[PDB]
Amino acid sequence: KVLFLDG
Amino acid sequence: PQITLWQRPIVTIKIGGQLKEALLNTGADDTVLEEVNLPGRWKPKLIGGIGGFVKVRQYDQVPIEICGHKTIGTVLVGPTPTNVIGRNLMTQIGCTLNF
Amino acid sequence: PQITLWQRPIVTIKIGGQLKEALLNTGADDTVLEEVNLPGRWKPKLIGGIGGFVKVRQYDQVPIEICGHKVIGTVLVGPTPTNVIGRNLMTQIGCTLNF
The CATH number covering residue B11 comes to 2.40.70.10
Q: Which amino acid is at B21?
A: E
Q: Is C28 on the interface with A (CB under 8 A)?
A: yes
Q: Is C5 on the interface with B (CB under 8 A)?
A: yes
Nearest CA among C72, C82, C9 for reference residue C38: C72
- Cβ-in-10-Å burial (0-12, 13-18, 19+) of B50 comes to exposed
Rounded to whole angstroms, how far apart are CA atoms C95 and B25?
14
Question: Which are the contacts of B52, defined by CB distance < 8 A and separation ≥ 6?
Answer: none
CB pairs under 8 A between A and B: 29
Quote the distance between the C-alpha of residue C71 and its chain's center: 12
Q: Cβ contact (<8 Å) for A2 and B29?
A: yes
Count the domains in chain C: 1
User: Chain C 42-71, CB below 8 Å of chain A: which residues?
Assistant: 47-49
Rounded to whole angstroms, how far apart are CA atoms B32 and B78?
7
Nearest CA among C28, C39, C32 for reference residue C54: C32
Rounded to whole angstroms, how far apart are CA atoms C61 and C22?
18
Q: Is A4 on the interface with B (CB under 8 A)?
A: yes
The residues pairing with B43 across neighbouring beta strands, listed in sequence order, are B58
Nearest CA among C26, C38, C34, C36 for reference residue C90: C26
Rounded to whole angstroms, how far apart are CA atoms C18 and C48?
26
Structural domain of C60: 1-99
| Neighbour-count burial for C62-99, b at 16+ CB within 10 Å, e otherwise | bebebbeeeeebbbbbbebebbbbbbbbbbbbebbbee
Nearest CA among C71, C70, C96 for reference residue C2: C96
Quote the distance between the C-alpha of residue B45 and its chain's center: 15
